[PDB]
Amino acid sequence: MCDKEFMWALKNGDLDEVKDYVAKGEDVNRTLEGGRKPLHYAADCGQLEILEFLLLKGADINAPDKHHITPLLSAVYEGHVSCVKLLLSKGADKTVKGPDGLTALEATDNQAIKALLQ
Questions:
Q1: Could you count the other beta carbons within 10 Å of the beta carbon of residue 101?
Q2: Would 70 disulfide with which of 59, 97, 109, 112, CB 3.0-4.6 Å?
Q3: Fold of the domain built from segment(s) 1-118
Q4: 48-57: b or e for each residue (b if 16 or more CB lie within 10 Å)?
Q5: Do residues 33 and 7 make contact, with C-beta atoms less than 8 angstroms apart?
């Protein structure tokens, strides 16, 4: 009944706001938009701090089924890749849901993304 605050937080780094909601009892898997999880906005723009958060609890780091993709690639085409680093540190593999060797290979040419293909 208020996705705005809940959602507008993942992106505006209001990590303190998304932290209060899950403070209830593990609920890191609610499509706030219509077909996306709170890990795309956090990865796409979570000051790299928000992604590790809602991931610490559950782990939509792989959940994806209809999105046929995992959030590590979300940061890949973002230039942040500060998350991908501490990301696979948990696993998240890299091609566990992408097309194929795309992951970091066909994703770009900067040595930061290629860091995940390491």
A1: 12
A2: 97
A3: 1.25.40
A4: bebbbbbbee
A5: yes
